[PDB]
Ligand binder design. Structure first.
Ligand SMILES: c1ncc2c(n1)NCC2
Ligand SMILES: c1ncc2c(n1)NCC2
Ligand SMILES: c1ncc2c(n1)NCC2
Ligand SMILES: c1ncc2c(n1)NCC2
Ligand SMILES: c1ncc2c(n1)NCC2
Lengths: 348, 348, 348, 348, 348
């Protein structure tokens, strides 16, 4: 007996949809859901989605409140829809997927992932919910996450971090590192060996290795000396060049974090969504050095050093493909006289 | 267990709210309520009110579908709120009253009219619903309608016509002529002697007397001759004067109906609401004769003749007060040399 | 002391803005202006313009309520702005001009047309308002209308009809036929010889000549015989050909009116604005004969006969230019063996 | 002579409504009020209320700009409406009350609180405005605030802090501590002995006692030792338990402030309004420990210590009612073997 | 071949409009432009302007991404429109000018500034774009900026700072200090000698002189002693008086910055636009001292000291006009016994 007033009752009393019985008075005006409290309207939800306000309200209330894979991972794995849950995309303030399965009568394409409409779609399954590992085994297409082993299925160890209510974290009181499994056309697919992005923020950036501590503490020339990075263009790629009108390099988040401590800069997120590589229109406030499309990736500095040091530096220009977050990231490598000139996530 | 989905289910299956159990998927977008039918959205309701879309939807679904007094009568009698029903105002496409009693959780000020919040409000009671005659008997303020006699209380015979789903009609299969009772501060009022407006349309106008048949059939001069109306300015007041830039007279609906048969005209309803006297910005299409504020009343021609023939014609200008639909309508009477110059509802 | 509440007071009490003092409570919700009447909101105005709701409300309230030239005439004469009035475009439900002069503080570019900002704009002047003939005399660019003669200036007799509150009519109680004058860069122009469109409706079409009476009364072959129209393709151009999937001809409003009496058809007005030539996507309901772009002109049948009879019929295809409503209308004339095949307004 | 353009003139020139004469051009688009400045539109107000945009604009402009009681206090005292002022609710960005008295023609239920419509409503009166103490004496229901004594009326000393333009502060240049008086059904009511919440922020939290300084400075075990809190579950209730998936305790704002200094966390305010007890969906970013409904109260630590130490610890579970901000706050007390297990504001 | 889908393609791929060929799917809902990415809608733009959403999207995409004069300077110089660029006003989130020249088909009044419609408008020209210095020489009205000298034109050295993508900065990698030129009615105008505002923020305020360092570091009485400011009311004007209900003075941004370090305060920007002098409704959080209209200017402290010390202190009250940002700023000077009482930017 699903209703707008019951979803609102659950939000008000339980903090989210919790299957509880009850109704609260609701008013919908434009794109906002309000509830009456002591004679006045109190805002419960502001629709930022392209779905109808009451529909987006129910999907948000029905969001998964357990640690779930970050939307960039689900996207990189080709996930189309989730089985009997809503993965809320906090970066877009919208459902991560267009349709649902057994969640909301307006967006449901099926009540169970076993329905034939779900066979061509890559359904996300959560091994923490009863019966979902079995539903993945019977699914034609799907991605499964588990906390432990599944007899016969070869696991892929995912990232350490997961998203819990929009907070990306490495769990201590909860498990956030999952085993990942994928099936394409009824066949279990081998997930590739991959690096993982660290999902850190510029404002609250923390080093996760002795190399990262040394990058943030040491001066540019002594860090490059200590880590034998001469001829790898870290001065351009990681530290950044703010001497010309066009900002040079600055493609690693740790380099932006180091700069941010000394002077501020504007990062225009012109495609605001979760992705392995992010594109920003950057304007350095100290110098006025700027770049319309500055691709940034948050790799652990050691992982980036390992990628660039593994490269052959004998050709003028080549596409270097690196698996990051299960996806193929093309990098552009420019060399001269056996030294790196630039190395950046190739702007497609 | 009131809900948006249940109100929508009732509209789709029963044509209105009928207390039936069930839910249909609903989407709200801007001011419209849609329901999904075979994968596509079908419009159920377009909000024309100043209330939230979902709230207006429920009050419209919960509208009274029996013949009810026309909103102009309820307003003239000082009705503030209705007891356990919604009087839908079809002229405004909105509820006739701001609040409800035992109807909708968002608009309810009380569940029963016996609650102390209803004591100072003139509550509308319908003697056709069980226990409402007794709720009026106990009420401090109220208006009661009945189909027959009430013990001890003397009735005021109302108009022949009532509104059934927005259709104003004189019932043949249903009773539309009610007895009216009114209480102010616990005292049963003596409702005054009143004329009633006829609530006719210009396009489907029907005469309701031999004088009205003769007005529409005969020529102007022979009707005035037959009914001894010389000196009463019917040529100006009722027939209308389209010879000058400002349209002269034309204050009786029957006169507009007669004109409408010969040539069309635009009637701008600049305050669209139900009222005893209506104001229109009229433009006669044949002549180009026009008037910004042309007050029109739909009185039976015989009743209008009685009013104008019962006035003293010895003063240049005076206010003539007439009880019409229980309200005091002021008219402006202009005379010269013992004859009428003009007579018009000075009301809005 | 202009205000929203004062404009609303004027609309409610005077039927339009009349400079009266007073205020009524107003509420604005989305694109609608409401006013409170006995505790409930009554709609005063629904904004159909691309201007802000309160601004469009004031321009509509301040609309010219005298017979004014039809917007197609003002446009054809290059009118940019009106002097101290608003020409309301009833076909678009919007002001005919972007800006105003001495009308509304939000849209005013000047308070008087003598301000230098108005010098390059063709200002519309109304000789019926005191001092406007003299403001046109001093203006660099302008269009003047008068009811009589102007000293020294030679007139161009305009169309018989004018628009009074959106009703196009030939005045009997008011004058609708104006003298037109135009100045370009300080020089009084000689307005060209022009035909005028008749501005009739399909539903209320009336013949304005003995030829038009004969077209509507007689059969196709006897009308063409009586008026010696053999070889002029009136069967195709005026009567219409509904025998093939593509509707043939039907470019004169009188021909659509004749057809409309026998059987209905849909006319999709895909560019809804006032213009000399109109384009309709027509679907004949009886036959299913249709045409995406069917250009229709409302010319007096005698004027259309004069145009087609004054053309050289010796070339396969050529452009025929005709001054209609002061503008140059291009027609496409197609001939074969000295007879007309088709003739149609190539205009939009 | 109230108007939209006059309210806007006052906002632009005086920073709020100040009864000044004048008008500025205004445009309303969707839910925003703009004014023209140097040819471009400048936003004056964005409507976040469920009232029409122009109406909410006027109530916001007419907001009380003197220190006023925090909305949680007015609500806890049953205040329905204010006398001749608007208490703006900055937490909701909306008027604290639905209707007004002598403020705005659209929301006014009366011009003076002496009107009979105000008798059943608890009207807020401000003794700092001339004649309001007398109006409270004549009011059937009301709440009065004063800066000093009222002859014969027994005062209740309110909180030290008040809200001045949305800034909660303890006044040094202005008086913020008021005497409070309440009347129910014509009878002056004795306000109960009460504790007061401190109205502090997590980000700018300041200790207001030596115990609060010691809580934030000392380690958990030495604070509990110093203040003899062994057996009172401060480790769970105040410090918080982040070791399991469900976050344990954390019901006192000072405990959240201490945690906030070490590591961040998300507090989802799912019912955003001012209240004595707040409910948050909390997610600890360091551990991933979370709780859907975590009730938080900002009491001075000494006051909380006094409440819990006053409890009988001999029963398994009991409801403990404490008067806070004039309202009865139910707490849930869970004991075992003469020691506290948990003590929290009971989730209703 | 301009289109919505091409503008969106440019935003997604180039970070702004870059004349590139291509189309991406777009959806417009209410005031937001979305693009489809991996089956879900991603927000590209939220319209905060009074222009249609698709039109504002194109003007924002077509914004000037080079360092440009701050909107306060362009306004103070009477700039109406820009030549073949869009100056985006980041403080209003809207175009700085109503119309464009050769930018967008919906807002263009002309394709080239040489068109006669641009002659009466003060067109902004950028000497960094080819042919714009010549277009300024031929323009009747205009403002020109250059990086170097223009043969024969007497330059005005502008402010050190410019706006690059909404970041006000003094360029190190780019030039931000321009030469300014103005023409009124075909005649090159001599720009006056002027002081410049510093365009600093309260939160990230940095001193730009030894006097400014001493103001922020030293105590009030020793700074006034060191700089011989006795009798100049710096205690009131610059430091601020928070002892009474009305906040005294506090008209220099550096004084607000010094206060901000010790205690917070709310600054209500009730007219949010870029201007030489700003007006704020300020509420000091520590004391509750407040002022509805507190005019603030960010002059370099030395420049302010120079202005006030240059004043004659022998009259009770006088208007003192100072040229700041090319505009005449009226100050109010109040003296008594040869000493300053107050000196503030006169509230108009
Ligand atoms: C594209 N981006 C950067 C570089 C390049 N091409 N050649 C050397 C450096
Ligand atoms: C106003 N209205 C109508 C009339 C009048 N004044 N004098 C004669 C008739
Ligand atoms: C285009 N439209 C009409 C016609 C034509 N081409 N050829 C003969 C008649
Ligand atoms: C509800 N909440 C917490 C507890 C309880 N019941 N029993 C002991 C601890
Ligand atoms: C206006 N504002 C401040 C002052 C004044 N007038 N006289 C002395 C001080």
């Amino acid at each position: 007996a699903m209703s707008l007033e019951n979803v609102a009752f659950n939000v008000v009393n339980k903090g989210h949809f919790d299957g509880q019985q009850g109704e609260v008075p609701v008013s919908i005006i434009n794109n906002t859901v309000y509830t009456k409290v002591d004679g006045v309207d109190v805002e419960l939800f502001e629709n930022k989605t392209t779905l109808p306000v009451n529909v987006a309200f129910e999907l948000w209330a029905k969001r998964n409140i357990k640690p779930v894979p970050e939307v960039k991972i689900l996207n990189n794995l080709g996930v189309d829809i989730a089985a009997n849950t809503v993965i809320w995309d906090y970066k877009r303030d919208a459902p991560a997927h267009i349709s649902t399965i057994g969640v909301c009568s307006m967006t449901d394409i099926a009540k169970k992932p076993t329905e034939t409409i779900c066979a061509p779609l890559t359904v996300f399954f959560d091994g923490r919910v009863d019966g979902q590992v079995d539903l993945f085994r019977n699914a034609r297409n799907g991605v499964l996450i588990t906390e432990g082993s599944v007899k016969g299925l070869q696991p892929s160890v995912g990232p350490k971090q997961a998203s819990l209510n929009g907070v990306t974290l490495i769990g201590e009181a909860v498990k956030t590192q999952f085993n990942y499994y994928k099936k394409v056309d009824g066949v279990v697919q081998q997930l590739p060996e991959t690096y993982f992005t660290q999902s850190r923020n510029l404002q609250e950036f923390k080093p996760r290795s002795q190399m990262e501590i040394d990058f943030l503490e040491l001066a540019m020339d002594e860090f490059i000396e200590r880590y034998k990075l001469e001829g790898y263009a870290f001065e351009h790629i990681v530290y950044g060049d703010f001497s010309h009108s066009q900002l040079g390099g600055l493609h690693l988040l740790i380099g932006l974090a180091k700069r941010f401590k000394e002077s501020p800069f504007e990062l225009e997120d012109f495609i605001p969504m979760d992705s392995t590589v992010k594109n920003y229109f950057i304007t350095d406030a100290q110098t006025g050095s700027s770049k319309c499309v500055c691709s940034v990736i948050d790799l652990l500095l050691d992982d980036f050093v390992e990628i660039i040091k593994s490269q052959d530096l004998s050709v003028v220009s080549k596409v270097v493909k690196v698996t990051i977050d299960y996806t193929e990231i093309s990098f552009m490598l420019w060399c001269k006289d056996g030294h790196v000139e630039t190395f950046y996530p190739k702007l497609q």
